[PDB]
Scaffold this active site. Sequence first.
Site, PDB file in Angstrom:
ATOM      1  N   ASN A   8       0.830  -1.186   0.000  1.00 34.70           N
ATOM      2  CA  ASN A   8       0.000   0.000   0.000  1.00 34.70           C
ATOM      3  C   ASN A   8       0.874   1.249   0.000  1.00 34.70           C
ATOM      4  O   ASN A   8       1.641   1.462   0.930  1.00 34.70           O
ATOM      5  CB  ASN A   8      -0.873  -0.006   1.240  1.00 34.70           C
ATOM      6  CG  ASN A   8      -2.257   0.524   0.976  1.00 34.70           C
ATOM      7  OD1 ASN A   8      -2.934   0.069   0.043  1.00 34.70           O
ATOM      8  ND2 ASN A   8      -2.709   1.421   1.835  1.00 34.70           N
ATOM      9  N   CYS A  13      -6.034   3.333  -4.379  1.00 26.74           N
ATOM     10  CA  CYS A  13      -7.450   3.030  -4.500  1.00 26.74           C
ATOM     11  C   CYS A  13      -7.624   1.671  -5.166  1.00 26.74           C
ATOM     12  O   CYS A  13      -7.323   0.650  -4.559  1.00 26.74           O
ATOM     13  CB  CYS A  13      -8.189   4.137  -5.247  1.00 26.74           C
ATOM     14  SG  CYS A  13      -8.254   5.687  -4.319  1.00 26.74           S
ATOM     15  N   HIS A 249     -12.196   1.312   1.559  1.00 27.12           N
ATOM     16  CA  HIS A 249     -11.283   0.198   1.357  1.00 27.12           C
ATOM     17  C   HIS A 249     -11.635  -0.550   0.075  1.00 27.12           C
ATOM     18  O   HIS A 249     -12.809  -0.821  -0.163  1.00 27.12           O
ATOM     19  CB  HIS A 249     -11.344  -0.757   2.548  1.00 27.12           C
ATOM     20  CG  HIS A 249     -10.151  -1.631   2.679  1.00 27.12           C
ATOM     21  ND1 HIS A 249      -8.868  -1.245   2.351  1.00 27.12           N
ATOM     22  CD2 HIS A 249     -10.063  -2.882   3.132  1.00 27.12           C
ATOM     23  CE1 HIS A 249      -8.041  -2.254   2.579  1.00 27.12           C
ATOM     24  NE2 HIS A 249      -8.742  -3.251   3.070  1.00 27.12           N
ATOM     25  N   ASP A 266      -6.447  -8.552  -0.151  1.00 33.15           N
ATOM     26  CA  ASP A 266      -6.392  -7.262   0.537  1.00 33.15           C
ATOM     27  C   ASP A 266      -4.946  -6.785   0.652  1.00 33.15           C
ATOM     28  O   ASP A 266      -4.257  -7.160   1.594  1.00 33.15           O
ATOM     29  CB  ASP A 266      -7.031  -7.333   1.920  1.00 33.15           C
ATOM     30  CG  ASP A 266      -7.382  -5.997   2.562  1.00 33.15           C
ATOM     31  OD1 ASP A 266      -6.717  -4.984   2.224  1.00 33.15           O
ATOM     32  OD2 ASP A 266      -8.345  -5.974   3.369  1.00 33.15           O
TER      33      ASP A 266
HETATM   34  O1  LIG Z   1     -12.680   4.293  -7.115  1.00 35.61           O
HETATM   35  C1  LIG Z   1     -13.689   4.946  -7.412  1.00 35.61           C
HETATM   36  C2  LIG Z   1     -14.158   5.934  -6.359  1.00 35.61           C
HETATM   37  C3  LIG Z   1     -13.814   7.383  -6.729  1.00 35.61           C
HETATM   38  C4  LIG Z   1     -13.738   8.075  -5.374  1.00 35.61           C
HETATM   39  N1  LIG Z   1     -14.962   7.963  -4.551  1.00 35.61           N
HETATM   40  C5  LIG Z   1     -14.692   8.450  -3.192  1.00 35.61           C
HETATM   41  C6  LIG Z   1     -13.251   8.293  -2.758  1.00 35.61           C
HETATM   42  C7  LIG Z   1     -12.710   7.030  -2.506  1.00 35.61           C
HETATM   43  C8  LIG Z   1     -11.380   6.898  -2.134  1.00 35.61           C
HETATM   44  C9  LIG Z   1     -10.572   8.015  -2.009  1.00 35.61           C
HETATM   45  C10 LIG Z   1     -11.097   9.267  -2.235  1.00 35.61           C
HETATM   46  C11 LIG Z   1     -12.426   9.409  -2.621  1.00 35.61           C
HETATM   47  C12 LIG Z   1     -15.560   6.617  -4.498  1.00 35.61           C
HETATM   48  C13 LIG Z   1     -15.625   5.984  -5.887  1.00 35.61           C
HETATM   49  C14 LIG Z   1     -16.435   4.705  -5.977  1.00 35.61           C
HETATM   50  C15 LIG Z   1     -17.745   4.798  -6.405  1.00 35.61           C
HETATM   51  C16 LIG Z   1     -18.531   3.667  -6.546  1.00 35.61           C
HETATM   52  C17 LIG Z   1     -18.023   2.435  -6.247  1.00 35.61           C
HETATM   53  C18 LIG Z   1     -16.735   2.323  -5.798  1.00 35.61           C
HETATM   54  C19 LIG Z   1     -15.940   3.452  -5.670  1.00 35.61           C
HETATM   55  N2  LIG Z   1     -14.250   4.725  -8.608  1.00 35.61           N
HETATM   56  C20 LIG Z   1     -15.250   5.543  -9.313  1.00 35.61           C
HETATM   57  C21 LIG Z   1     -16.435   4.701  -9.724  1.00 35.61           C
HETATM   58  C22 LIG Z   1     -16.010   3.478 -10.533  1.00 35.61           C
HETATM   59  O2  LIG Z   1     -15.253   3.936 -11.653  1.00 35.61           O
HETATM   60  C23 LIG Z   1     -17.165   2.608 -11.086  1.00 35.61           C
HETATM   61  N3  LIG Z   1     -17.821   3.280 -12.221  1.00 35.61           N
HETATM   62  C24 LIG Z   1     -17.299   3.135 -13.476  1.00 35.61           C
HETATM   63  N4  LIG Z   1     -17.763   3.678 -14.548  1.00 35.61           N
HETATM   64  C25 LIG Z   1     -18.881   4.496 -14.417  1.00 35.61           C
HETATM   65  C26 LIG Z   1     -19.405   5.106 -15.558  1.00 35.61           C
HETATM   66  C27 LIG Z   1     -20.488   5.932 -15.460  1.00 35.61           C
HETATM   67  C28 LIG Z   1     -21.098   6.161 -14.218  1.00 35.61           C
HETATM   68  C29 LIG Z   1     -20.612   5.550 -13.089  1.00 35.61           C
HETATM   69  C30 LIG Z   1     -19.495   4.720 -13.183  1.00 35.61           C
HETATM   70  C31 LIG Z   1     -18.945   4.076 -12.001  1.00 35.61           C
HETATM   71  O3  LIG Z   1     -19.396   4.215 -10.876  1.00 35.61           O
HETATM   72  C32 LIG Z   1     -14.998   2.686  -9.717  1.00 35.61           C
HETATM   73  C33 LIG Z   1     -13.813   3.533  -9.358  1.00 35.61           C
END
Ligand code: A1ICV
Length: 324
Positions: A8, A13, A249, A266
Site C-alpha cells: 500500500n 485506491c 477500502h 487485501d
Molecule cells: O474508485 C472509485 C471511487 C472514486 C472516489 N470515490 C470516493 C473516494 C474514494 C477513495 C478516495 C477518495 C475518494 C468513491 C468511488 C467509488 C464509487 C462507486 C463504487 C466504488 C468506488 N471509482 C469511481 C467509480 C467506478 O469507476 C465505477 N464506475 C465506473 N464507470 C462508471 C461510468 C459511469 C457512471 C458511473 C461509473 C462508475 O461508478 C470505480 C472507481
Amino acid sequence: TGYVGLKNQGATCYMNSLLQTLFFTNQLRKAVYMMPTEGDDSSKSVPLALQRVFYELQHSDKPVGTKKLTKSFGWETLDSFMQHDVQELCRVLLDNVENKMKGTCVEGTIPKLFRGKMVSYIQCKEVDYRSDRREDYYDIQLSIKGKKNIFESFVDYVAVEQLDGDNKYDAGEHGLQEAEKGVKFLTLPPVLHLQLMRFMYDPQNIKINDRFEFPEQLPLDEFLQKTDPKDPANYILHAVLVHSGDNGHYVVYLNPKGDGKWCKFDDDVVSRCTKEEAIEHNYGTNAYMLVYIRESKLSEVLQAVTDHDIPQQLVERLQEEKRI
Ligand SMILES: O=C([C@H]1CCN(Cc2ccccc2)C[C@@H]1c1ccccc1)N1CCC(O)(Cn2cnc3ccccc3c2=O)CC1
C-alpha cells in the site's frame, strides 16, 4: 495460498485490485513478459514497469510494491485516482502494452482478449432512413439504479430508446423526426470487463449502495443478435472488484485458476474465502467491477505459466535492479 500480495502506498485506491485481475489473466501475463523492452528507460516506461510488477508477483515471497509503476504513467497529484474510473486506468495500461507488441510474435493479443464489436443504430418511424455505425469496445458500463440484477442491466442496455418532440432526430434531408435509437451486440470478447454505474451525481456525485445481483454463470445468447450452436456466450465469474464506504477500502476476490476456489486479495494479505463471501456477500460492501471469462476460452486464457516463460535478458535486467 501460494499467491502474493501488493504493498500500500496509499490512495492507489483500485490500482492494486486492477493489477491482480490483470496478473491472473494468464494469457495477458505471458504476452507482457514477451514484449521487447531491452533498451528502455526504467523510470518512465509503462511496459517495463508492468513487467517488474508481474515478475515480482510471480516470484516474490514478500509483499510486492508498485511505486515505480505509479511513477511511469504519472498519477501523483493528490487527486489522480479519486478523479478517474477503473476503466480509465486499465485503458492506460493495456494501451501502452498493445502498442509495445506491434511487430512482434504476440502483436494484437489485447484486442484478441478484451475487444468486442457493437452496432449502434437509429431508425426513422414513418420515413426510410437508417444509420448503422459499428463500434469496437473493450469494456461495458451497466445501469444499477432500479435494476435488481445483471440480466435487467443488459435488457436495459439494449432497450430501444425513443426520439419524440424536444428530442426529435435530425435526418437532414427529411427534417426533424420521431425515431428509435438502440444498441446491439455483434460479439462478446473472451474476457468480459463490466463496470457497475454506482457513482452518480445529485444536487451538488455519490455512491449507490443498493442491492445488485450477479451470478457465477452468465448466458448472453439472449443479447446476441445472432448466435452460434458451437460457441455459445456463457461466462464464468473470474474476478469481483469491491469497494466499501464513502468519503474507504478496496479489495478484490478472485478464483485465479477458474475452478471456483476463491481468494480475498487485501493489499499484502491474501487469504482463502468462501464463494458466498465473494459473490452474494458483495451484492449490497459491494462490487463496482466484474470480470467474466467465456467457458470455451477458459483453458487458453488461464493457461499455466512456468518460471521459464520469462525470457533471460528480462530476468537478468531485473535481478540487477534489485541489487542496487
Ligand atoms: O474508485 C472509485 C471511487 C472514486 C472516489 N470515490 C470516493 C473516494 C474514494 C477513495 C478516495 C477518495 C475518494 C468513491 C468511488 C467509488 C464509487 C462507486 C463504487 C466504488 C468506488 N471509482 C469511481 C467509480 C467506478 O469507476 C465505477 N464506475 C465506473 N464507470 C462508471 C461510468 C459511469 C457512471 C458511473 C461509473 C462508475 O461508478 C470505480 C472507481
